[PDB]
Symmetry: T
Subunit: 64 residues, 12 copies
Amino acid sequence: VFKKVLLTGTSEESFTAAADDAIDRAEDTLDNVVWAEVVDQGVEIGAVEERTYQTEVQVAFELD
Amino acid sequence: VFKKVLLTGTSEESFTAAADDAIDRAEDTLDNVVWAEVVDQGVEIGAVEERTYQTEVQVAFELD
Amino acid sequence: VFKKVLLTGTSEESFTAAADDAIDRAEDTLDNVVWAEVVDQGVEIGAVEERTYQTEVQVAFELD
Amino acid sequence: VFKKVLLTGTSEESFTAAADDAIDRAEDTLDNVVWAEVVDQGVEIGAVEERTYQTEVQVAFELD
Amino acid sequence: VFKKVLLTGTSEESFTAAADDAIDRAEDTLDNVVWAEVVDQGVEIGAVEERTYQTEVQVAFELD
Amino acid sequence: VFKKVLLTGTSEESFTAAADDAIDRAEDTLDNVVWAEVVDQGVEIGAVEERTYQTEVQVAFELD
Amino acid sequence: VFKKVLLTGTSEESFTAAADDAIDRAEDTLDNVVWAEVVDQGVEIGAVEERTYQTEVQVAFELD
Amino acid sequence: VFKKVLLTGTSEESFTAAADDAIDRAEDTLDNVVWAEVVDQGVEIGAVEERTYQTEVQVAFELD
Amino acid sequence: VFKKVLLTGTSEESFTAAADDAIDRAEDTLDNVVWAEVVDQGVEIGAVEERTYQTEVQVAFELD
Amino acid sequence: VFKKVLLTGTSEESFTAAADDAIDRAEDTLDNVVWAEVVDQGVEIGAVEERTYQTEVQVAFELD
Amino acid sequence: VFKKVLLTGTSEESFTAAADDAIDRAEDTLDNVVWAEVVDQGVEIGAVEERTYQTEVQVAFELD
Amino acid sequence: VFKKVLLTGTSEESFTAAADDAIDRAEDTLDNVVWAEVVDQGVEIGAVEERTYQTEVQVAFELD
Ligand SMILES: [Cl-]
Ligand SMILES: [Cl-]
Ligand SMILES: [Cl-]
Ligand SMILES: [Cl-]
Ligand SMILES: [Mg+2]
Ligand SMILES: [Mg+2]
Ligand SMILES: [Mg+2]
Ligand SMILES: [Mg+2]
Ligand SMILES: [Mg+2]
Ligand SMILES: [Mg+2]
Ligand SMILES: [Mg+2]
Ligand SMILES: [Mg+2]
Ligand SMILES: [Mg+2]
Ligand SMILES: [Mg+2]
Ligand SMILES: [Mg+2]
Ligand SMILES: [Mg+2]
Ligand SMILES: [Mg+2]
Ligand SMILES: [Mg+2]
Ligand SMILES: [Mg+2]
Ligand SMILES: [Mg+2]
Ligand SMILES: [Mg+2]
Ligand SMILES: [Mg+2]
Ligand SMILES: [Mg+2]
Ligand SMILES: [Mg+2]
Ligand SMILES: [Mg+2]
Ligand SMILES: [Mg+2]
Ligand SMILES: [Mg+2]
Ligand SMILES: [Mg+2]
Ligand code: NA
Ligand code: NA
Ligand code: NA
Ligand code: NA
């Protein structure tokens, strides 16, 4: 059985690095993370100083 | 990193109050709840006595 | 077996009351209405005097 | 010909009143606003003091 | 309030049995599981020996 | 001209048999049923004793 | 209250004329047909002699 | 950079001519219109005398 | 078994004729073409002299 | 690099067996088929004698 | 009230830089740009010399 | 007439480079490749040693 958690990673560099930010968080706290699917991307502009790229991913991990 | 939980709030009054019901539950159990996105709305009719409005929301909270 | 009818309710007060308007019509004419799913919401402005909220719902009823 | 503008209204009371907030802005600045379609709804929580309901609408107005 | 978890069940027999695999896992670890919605179906071919049917479901459970 | 009715069939055995349940109902009451399209699948768990698979189909029938 | 029926019109000439075919059928049998929304278009090729354009529309009519 | 405006053209003849109606309006008022994408089609019936086909397009134009 | 190829037909006359343009190409090169589904429509404006209507279709053909 | 082909398998038994029918065809003619994603399911009724379940899948295969 | 404009940025380097290209244009001409949502990404190949990445974003700005 | 092939490119560096990987493969084997549309992005984690970014694109090429 896989389960997925819906995480939004952030980066001031790129949408790929914001996806990695989410995946890195998942691998800090979960075992057997196996793949991630991008579900949305956006950029925070007027709530930060430097633009911050955001990549939301469903990160799947195998249960047991 | 944000994470989102998918909750369905209920109310016998309105779709706004059913969204609040979900958000109130999230804020009971999670820190740093930051925003919620409505993903579906419906009304339970023939499983309750009074119609019950249901609002399903992805509720985002900031991790740490 | 459930069947669904696609109805748009209207209200000059709110999207919840426009959903009820549809559901009330379904319960006038159908037996065993069991739940309704909101599929679209909108507001008529320049075809009415007062804005009229519209909530389109699939209303499900159990057959027999 | 109709044209549509994509506006997000806000309210601390309800999703209907946040839709009205957008429509009121459109009618302040545009002639012949004729209808609005809800395209998304959400609630700002951790960027405000009181929750703020947001309703994004495409507001259509007739050209000429 | 309901909450949903996004699980992918697997089976070497059928998409129905892969949905049951997910639901069985949810009922092992959660109380008051109430319904599941299929969100995607697929078949793993070249990472297994026998084809493995996969059914991804949002499984809803009532909170408290 | 074809018309479609939106029916949810149920089965305690499989999603295929729940699709047949809907189609069988349509053919009980309609002439010239010609095809059905699956639009959603789900499983009722905590409102029944045995899990009940549900397959919602648009069932098309030719008019005249 | 509006209700919508999901009809597929056909024409050997064009997608507009197939939409009219559906609408004409609705106006034969329903009062107060008010608008139709195109939901899908396709062409039957290998089940007919001449290609037949098909336009599926939700046709809305006002109830009473 | 391209920008798009969301326009609904109308015609009493066809969905192609309603798309042209929108595009003609855009080219009256904008420079460097480069392409248009159809996003919805419908027919107004009970608000006009003759049916009026409507084609909504995102019309893209190159900025500068 | 059916297989589908994703083709965009073009016409300077209409979206129906652009769908035919794709289908004609498929029937030039494939046997047993059986139906086509429209998946997108658009108009090329600023890359041509006369507007060119484009209709993208999945064209299905029966294998063997 | 993976490439996907869009195939509709058929079966008179079940949607799982119709998915296998497509996959079996792909593995007859392609090397390194690695997974398949279900994209639509339906049932042919009034063009056959016995109902025929149809499962459309994107079947992915690794190139080289 | 927020309003959004639908812009396609371009870059010969990356999809992140094409999103920035759009956002930079919006900030040249609009005050209080607050966030951008990616809605589509693509690559122009046979209309340019070097591939050009394109990122279409809805860019939101706060009105007043 | 354009035709599109559905390819998933991979890269251990970025989603832009995974889109290029697909496009490079298409240009190895097809003439007149004209543009590509991103349809999905994901990251393989637990089937590789280093994360591998995947970008699925419909790559369009002009026929003749
Ligand atoms: Cl989710
Ligand atoms: Cl429907
Ligand atoms: Cl495809
Ligand atoms: Cl828009
Ligand atoms: Mg930096
Ligand atoms: Mg988002
Ligand atoms: Mg009360
Ligand atoms: Mg729901
Ligand atoms: Mg009043
Ligand atoms: Mg509507
Ligand atoms: Mg107050
Ligand atoms: Mg939003
Ligand atoms: Mg076995
Ligand atoms: Mg999947
Ligand atoms: Mg049994
Ligand atoms: Mg459902
Ligand atoms: Mg003729
Ligand atoms: Mg169809
Ligand atoms: Mg005329
Ligand atoms: Mg519309
Ligand atoms: Mg001509
Ligand atoms: Mg297109
Ligand atoms: Mg048999
Ligand atoms: Mg289909
Ligand atoms: Mg360079
Ligand atoms: Mg695009
Ligand atoms: Mg490296
Ligand atoms: Mg994918
Ligand atoms: Na989730
Ligand atoms: Na219907
Ligand atoms: Na394809
Ligand atoms: Na817009």
